Write an enzyme that holds these catalytic residues in place. Structure first.
Site, short mmCIF file in Angstrom:
data_model
loop_
_atom_site.label_atom_id
_atom_site.label_comp_id
_atom_site.label_asym_id
_atom_site.label_seq_id
_atom_site.Cartn_x
_atom_site.Cartn_y
_atom_site.Cartn_z
N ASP A 1 0.82 -1.22 0.00
CA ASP A 1 0.00 0.00 0.00
C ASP A 1 0.85 1.27 0.00
OD1 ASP A 1 0.94 0.25 2.60
OD2 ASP A 1 -1.05 0.31 3.53
N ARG B 1 1.11 6.86 -0.04
CA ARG B 1 0.17 5.90 0.48
C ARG B 1 -0.93 5.72 -0.55
NH1 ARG B 1 -3.37 2.77 2.03
NH2 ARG B 1 -3.71 2.09 4.18
N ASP C 1 -6.87 -0.73 1.96
CA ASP C 1 -6.07 -1.33 3.00
C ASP C 1 -5.55 -2.68 2.51
OD1 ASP C 1 -6.25 0.53 5.33
OD2 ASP C 1 -8.35 -0.05 5.36
N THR C 2 -4.23 -2.82 2.41
CA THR C 2 -3.70 -4.14 2.07
C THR C 2 -3.17 -4.80 3.33
OG1 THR C 2 -1.55 -3.21 1.56
CG2 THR C 2 -3.02 -3.52 -0.26
N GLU D 1 -0.28 -6.05 5.52
CA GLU D 1 1.05 -5.43 5.49
C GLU D 1 2.15 -6.44 5.80
OE1 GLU D 1 1.12 -1.31 7.39
OE2 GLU D 1 -0.96 -1.89 7.75
N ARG E 1 3.12 11.36 4.10
CA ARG E 1 2.92 10.61 2.86
C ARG E 1 1.91 11.23 1.91
NH1 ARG E 1 1.70 4.67 5.03
NH2 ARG E 1 0.16 5.94 6.21
#
Length: 136
Positions: free
Chosen positions: A16, A30, A35-36, A38, A82
């Site tokens: 992500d 980002r 949402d991946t 992590e 980010r």
């Protein structure tokens, strides 16, 4: 009217997060709205489908001819500095590809950074109906 701008890959960091050269500056980005799992999660660590999501984002940004960033209509950076953006690899949105593959969920959304929200949610419904990866 959202617009794409060119960027150059520096390094993929996670499913992500990607580091890019943007308007001459190294910047961490980002991926907006997703949402991946992590590999570098603050608490859990290397979650399930994390390496896979991370390898998918890397191959995709590493193999592209052209990378582009697209900021949304709200804040363009988060509290960690980010960049907040949709990333495109030869015209294909990486954020959507991850979701379409069952390698990311649609995140909790904050107006007004929600322009591609419905599109994503439609690919997420498809990946769940196809029971892919995260959804199997």
């Amino acid at each position: 009217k959202l617009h794409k701008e060119p960027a150059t890959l520096i390094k993929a960091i996670d499913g992500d997060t990607v580091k890019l050269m943007y308007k001459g500056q190294p910047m961490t980005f980002r991926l907006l709205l997703v949402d991946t799992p992590e590999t570098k999660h603050p608490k859990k660590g290397v979650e399930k489908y994390g390496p896979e999501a991370s390898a998918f984002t890397k191959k995709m940004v590493e193999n592209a001819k052209k990378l582009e960033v697209e900021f949304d209509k709200g804040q363009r950076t988060d509290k960690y500095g980010r960049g907040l953006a949709y990333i495109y690899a030869d015209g294909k949105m990486v954020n959507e590809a991850l979701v379409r593959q069952g390698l990311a969920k649609v995140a909790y959304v904050y107006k007004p950074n929600n322009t591609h929200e419905q599109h994503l949610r439609k690919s997420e419904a498809q990946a769940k109906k196809e029971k892919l990866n995260i959804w199997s």
